[PDB]
Design a protein around this ligand. Structure first.
Ligand SMILES: CCc1cc(O)ccc1-c1ccc2c(C(=O)Nc3ccc(C)nc3)n[nH]c2c1
Length: 291
């Protein structure tokens, strides 16, 4: 049931792409009458042996994952061999939470934002049981199944903690989403459950800005860094700002208990950040107290 051949895949539209890989909406049509299922297909552009290995790892991670708030794995297309693999994932027509929230902001109140928030916490909790560190938690990488269900997607950066260590050190990072990254991820390239918790704080921030462009994490951090950028890089400026307890401001509208959860997630000390279970319990209870 998981054997997808190249001759049956039909291109419909490009959903998005990056520097090394792309995501397309395709129809898997073995009966060639256009009745076949519509799927999301990932492929790579210019592949080195370690980019190939990363993709093989992502596929292994995706194989083992079954959860209501995690995007469904379907299979792989082996037709062109190891060198040119295609990852087959479920096509979600409502797209990313980032885009979905901007579009439907008038029908998405605080109670709904917290509904999404705790689904992300439960998904992340399940990830933790397998020692998986996501590394790319952001509303752009959360996908929408319907008005009442969101799913964590893009597992392209996801790593597996060693059996005896609580962090994973990435030996060669490319372009990173630095305005979602914990300080220790920036300074030491160390990724853990606690760095995912930091990132979840930024996701919660995202949700309560309603994806207002001027209030996005890059926008506010660049504003906070200032016009005197001479002498050092942006990442260096961000490191000093975070070290000095500079943080993303409270959106004017955001409940104080919600902003508190953010600032706790944004603790400099990895050992003082809350757990995803605690986060789920605190979010569910604030959501209950609202209605
Ligand atoms: C296949 C790559 C991947 C890799 C991974 O590790 C986890 C999830 C995915 C993935 C990423 C994106 C999507 C989407 C979508 O992008 N949907 C949409 C719909 C409509 C529009 C306009 N744009 C967009 N649907 N299923 C998706 C699965």
């Amino acid at each position: 049931p998981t054997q997808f051949e190249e001759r049956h895949l039909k291109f419909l539209q490009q959903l998005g792409k990056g520097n090394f890989g792309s995501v397309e909406m395709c129809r898997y049509d073995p009966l060639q009458d256009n009745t076949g299922e519509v799927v999301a297909v990932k492929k790579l552009q210019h592949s080195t042996e370690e980019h190939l290995r990363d993709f093989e790892r992502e596929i292994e991670i995706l194989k083992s994952l079954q959860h209501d708030n995690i995007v469904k794995y379907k299979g792989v297309c082996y037709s062109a061999g190891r060198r040119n693999l295609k990852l087959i994932m479920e096509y979600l027509p409502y797209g990313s939470l980032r885009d979905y929230l901007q579009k439907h902001k008038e029908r998405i109140d605080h109670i709904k934002l917290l509904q999404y928030t705790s689904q992300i916490c439960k998904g992340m909790e399940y990830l933790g049981t397998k020692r998986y560190i996501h590394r790319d938690l952001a509303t752009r990488n959360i996908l929408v199944e319907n008005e009442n269900r969101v799913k964590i997607g893009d597992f392209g950066l996801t790593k597996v903690l060693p059996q005896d260590k609580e962090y994973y050190k990435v030996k060669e990072p490319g372009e990173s989403p630095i305005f979602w990254y914990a300080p220790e991820s920036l300074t030491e390239s160390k990724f853990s459950v606690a760095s995912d918790v930091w990132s979840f704080g930024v996701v919660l921030y995202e949700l309560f800005t309603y994806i207002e462009k001027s209030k996005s994490p890059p926008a506010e951090f660049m504003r906070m860094i200032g016009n005197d950028k001479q002498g050092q890089s942006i990442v260096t400026h961000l490191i000093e700002l975070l070290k000095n307890n500079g943080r993303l401001p409270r959106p004017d509208g955001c409940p104080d208990e919600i902003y508190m959860i953010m600032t706790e997630c944004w603790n400099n000390n990895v050992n003082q950040r809350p757990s995803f279970r605690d986060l789920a319990l605190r979010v569910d209870q604030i959501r209950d107290n609202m209605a």
